[PDB]
Design an enzyme around this catalytic site. Structure first.
Site, PDB file in Angstrom:
ATOM      1  CG  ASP A   1      43.890  36.709  44.749  1.00  0.00           C
ATOM      2  OD1 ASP A   1      43.463  35.555  44.913  1.00  0.00           O
ATOM      3  OD2 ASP A   1      44.257  37.146  43.629  1.00  0.00           O
TER       4      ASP A   1
ATOM      5  CE1 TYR B   1      47.737  37.893  38.679  1.00  0.00           C
ATOM      6  CE2 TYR B   1      47.592  38.045  41.091  1.00  0.00           C
ATOM      7  CZ  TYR B   1      46.984  37.810  39.861  1.00  0.00           C
ATOM      8  OH  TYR B   1      45.655  37.422  39.838  1.00  0.00           O
TER       9      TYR B   1
ATOM     10  CE  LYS C   1      44.163  34.191  41.635  1.00  0.00           C
ATOM     11  NZ  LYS C   1      45.154  35.215  41.958  1.00  0.00           N
TER      12      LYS C   1
ATOM     13  CG  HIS D   1      45.737  32.160  37.215  1.00  0.00           C
ATOM     14  ND1 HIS D   1      44.743  33.102  36.991  1.00  0.00           N
ATOM     15  CD2 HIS D   1      46.841  32.862  37.548  1.00  0.00           C
ATOM     16  CE1 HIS D   1      45.233  34.308  37.172  1.00  0.00           C
ATOM     17  NE2 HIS D   1      46.506  34.192  37.507  1.00  0.00           N
TER      18      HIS D   1
HETATM   19  N1  LIG Z   1      41.869  34.977  38.896  1.00  0.00           N
HETATM   20  C1  LIG Z   1      41.997  35.883  37.917  1.00  0.00           C
HETATM   21  O1  LIG Z   1      42.056  35.608  36.724  1.00  0.00           O
HETATM   22  C2  LIG Z   1      42.152  37.342  38.306  1.00  0.00           C
HETATM   23  C3  LIG Z   1      42.085  38.305  37.304  1.00  0.00           C
HETATM   24  C4  LIG Z   1      42.112  39.677  37.609  1.00  0.00           C
HETATM   25  C5  LIG Z   1      42.210  40.024  38.945  1.00  0.00           C
HETATM   26  N2  LIG Z   1      42.295  39.066  39.971  1.00  0.00           N
HETATM   27  C6  LIG Z   1      42.509  39.427  41.393  1.00  0.00           C
HETATM   28  O2  LIG Z   1      41.603  40.462  41.757  1.00  0.00           O
HETATM   29  C7  LIG Z   1      42.347  41.538  42.298  1.00  0.00           C
HETATM   30  C8  LIG Z   1      41.503  42.801  42.029  1.00  0.00           C
HETATM   31  O3  LIG Z   1      41.262  42.863  40.600  1.00  0.00           O
HETATM   32  P1  LIG Z   1      42.034  43.977  39.709  1.00  0.00           P
HETATM   33  O4  LIG Z   1      43.446  44.188  40.165  1.00  0.00           O
HETATM   34  O5  LIG Z   1      41.704  43.642  38.294  1.00  0.00           O
HETATM   35  O6  LIG Z   1      41.387  45.443  40.054  1.00  0.00           O
HETATM   36  P2  LIG Z   1      40.408  46.264  41.036  1.00  0.00           P
HETATM   37  O7  LIG Z   1      40.591  45.786  42.391  1.00  0.00           O
HETATM   38  O8  LIG Z   1      39.110  46.163  40.378  1.00  0.00           O
HETATM   39  O9  LIG Z   1      41.004  47.768  40.877  1.00  0.00           O
HETATM   40  C9  LIG Z   1      42.403  48.050  40.974  1.00  0.00           C
HETATM   41  C10 LIG Z   1      42.504  49.518  40.678  1.00  0.00           C
HETATM   42  O10 LIG Z   1      41.569  50.312  41.409  1.00  0.00           O
HETATM   43  C11 LIG Z   1      42.275  51.315  42.144  1.00  0.00           C
HETATM   44  N3  LIG Z   1      41.663  51.520  43.483  1.00  0.00           N
HETATM   45  C12 LIG Z   1      41.719  50.720  44.585  1.00  0.00           C
HETATM   46  N4  LIG Z   1      41.032  51.235  45.611  1.00  0.00           N
HETATM   47  C13 LIG Z   1      40.539  52.375  45.097  1.00  0.00           C
HETATM   48  C14 LIG Z   1      39.771  53.339  45.772  1.00  0.00           C
HETATM   49  N5  LIG Z   1      39.421  53.201  47.040  1.00  0.00           N
HETATM   50  N6  LIG Z   1      39.445  54.478  45.105  1.00  0.00           N
HETATM   51  C15 LIG Z   1      39.863  54.682  43.839  1.00  0.00           C
HETATM   52  N7  LIG Z   1      40.594  53.749  43.200  1.00  0.00           N
HETATM   53  C16 LIG Z   1      40.937  52.590  43.791  1.00  0.00           C
HETATM   54  C17 LIG Z   1      43.680  50.817  42.278  1.00  0.00           C
HETATM   55  O11 LIG Z   1      44.617  51.907  42.383  1.00  0.00           O
HETATM   56  P3  LIG Z   1      45.969  51.906  43.265  1.00  0.00           P
HETATM   57  O12 LIG Z   1      46.506  50.505  43.374  1.00  0.00           O
HETATM   58  O13 LIG Z   1      46.775  52.884  42.500  1.00  0.00           O
HETATM   59  O14 LIG Z   1      45.575  52.421  44.567  1.00  0.00           O
HETATM   60  C18 LIG Z   1      43.837  50.050  41.012  1.00  0.00           C
HETATM   61  O15 LIG Z   1      44.219  50.953  40.008  1.00  0.00           O
HETATM   62  C19 LIG Z   1      43.633  41.455  41.498  1.00  0.00           C
HETATM   63  O16 LIG Z   1      44.733  42.242  41.947  1.00  0.00           O
HETATM   64  C20 LIG Z   1      43.906  39.977  41.568  1.00  0.00           C
HETATM   65  O17 LIG Z   1      44.451  39.758  42.841  1.00  0.00           O
HETATM   66  C21 LIG Z   1      42.282  37.713  39.639  1.00  0.00           C
END
Ligand SMILES: NC(=O)c1ccc[n+]([C@@H]2O[C@H](COP(=O)([O-])OP(=O)(O)OC[C@H]3O[C@@H](n4cnc5c(N)ncnc54)[C@H](OP(=O)(O)O)[C@@H]3O)[C@@H](O)[C@H]2O)c1
Length: 314
Positions: free
Chosen positions: A42, A47, A76, A109
């Site tokens: 993704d 970003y 996006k 997006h």
């Molecule tokens: N379309 C939209 O508007 C939108 C908005 C927000 C997000 N997204 C997409 O969704 C993806 C995921 O959402 P998000 O980045 O908000 O966050 P997330 O996936 O909910 O969490 C990311 C955080 O969790 C930690 N983490 C990952 N695996 C873990 C594990 N096994 N144990 C403990 N901690 C863990 C990561 O740490 P480390 O990286 O330090 O390991 C990071 O700090 C985004 O990167 C993006 O690609 C899209």
């Protein structure tokens, strides 16, 4: 391991997220994910790391670890490029950075258009976000023509409420249905109504922020944590898994695609080991009951935009 989209293509149910993945770490992160077995990444222009993602995808294609047809790459369209005339150009920029010649899925997006320019969030002198007068239907027509050009295989939306989805579904002369609506979803914001709605319409739902986005720049300053919720730790212990592996398995059993972000090699590996176990129906019902309508991503600077998605109930 894959869901069928309305264009006949199959999308991997697990993907790697890249928001907040620093340019200096995401190349290695993506290489490691592909080695581990991830086939879906993704991305987004906003970003500011698509060049560095693209370096990783190129290295793995050159090494023949994967064929292009086996990869499912998502980006996006940012809010400053909603004008009909700018959509192709934004897509092409992304294709360059990623060093690809087509995307598998391209999303709007946010439904909100902003003034075009170099700022991702253009502000007036009062410091409010400057909107574009564009609408959702004109931006969709521009996305449709990306498909006819062969630049993308499928098009979708992100952060649309059900009326905004409705609006596209009722568009006179609608040529391509949205394949995917990517929305925030985890045990604190379960989205049962919007998920029932999209799934009834044959739109696949992707859950973003499945772990609650512990690294989001904004505060909550301290406060609520999914990874540390003792009730969710209990369900994990019982299965001899981690709470992250439970949080990732949860959307999968609701037939959602899920895209956890990590730049840490051991967690990228840990997050992949979610195909070999099953939450019971008791577990699922329990996790659903933790809903508290708590959003991580509320786009709070655009709350008076004509197209802000979160005033509606679902
Ligand atoms: N379309 C939209 O508007 C939108 C908005 C927000 C997000 N997204 C997409 O969704 C993806 C995921 O959402 P998000 O980045 O908000 O966050 P997330 O996936 O909910 O969490 C990311 C955080 O969790 C930690 N983490 C990952 N695996 C873990 C594990 N096994 N144990 C403990 N901690 C863990 C990561 O740490 P480390 O990286 O330090 O390991 C990071 O700090 C985004 O990167 C993006 O690609 C899209």
């Amino acid at each position: 391991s894959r869901l069928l989209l309305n264009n006949g293509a199959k999308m991997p149910i697990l993907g790697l997220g890249t928001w907040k993945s620093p340019p200096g770490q995401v190349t290695e992160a993506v290489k490691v994910a592909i080695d581990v077995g991830y086939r879906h990444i993704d991305c987004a222009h906003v970003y500011q790391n698509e060049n560095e993602v693209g370096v990783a995808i190129q290295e793995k294609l050159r090494e023949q670890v994967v064929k292009r047809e086996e990869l499912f790459i998502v980006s996006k369209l940012w809010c400053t490029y909603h004008e009909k005339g700018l959509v192709k150009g934004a897509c092409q920029k992304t294709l360059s950075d990623l060093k690809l010649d087509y995307l598998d899925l391209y999303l709007i997006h946010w439904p909100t258009g902003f003034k075009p320019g170099k700022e991702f969030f253009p502000l007036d002198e009062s410091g409010n976000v400057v909107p574009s007068d564009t609408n959702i239907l004109d931006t969709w027509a521009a996305m449709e023509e990306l498909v006819d050009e062969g630049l993308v295989k499928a098009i979708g939306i992100s952060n649309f409420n059900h009326l905004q989805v409705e609006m596209i579904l009722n568009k006179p002369g609608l040529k391509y249905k949205p394949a995917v609506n990517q929305i925030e979803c985890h045990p604190y914001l379960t989205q049962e109504k919007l998920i029932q709605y999209c799934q009834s319409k044959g739109i696949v739902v992707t859950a973003y922020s499945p772990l609650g986005s512990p690294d989001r720049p904004w505060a909550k300053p301290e406060d609520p944590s999914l990874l540390e919720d003792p009730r969710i730790k209990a369900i994990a212990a019982k299965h001899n898994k981690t709470t992250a592996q439970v949080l990732i398995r949860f959307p999968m059993q609701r037939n959602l695609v899920v895209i956890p972000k990590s730049v840490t090699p051991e967690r990228i590996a840990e997050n992949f080991k979610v195909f070999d176990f099953e939450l019971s129906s008791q577990d699922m019902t329990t996790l659903l009951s933790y809903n508290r309508n708590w959003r991580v991503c509320a786009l709070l600077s655009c709350t008076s935009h004509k197209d802000y998605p979160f005033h509606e109930e679902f």
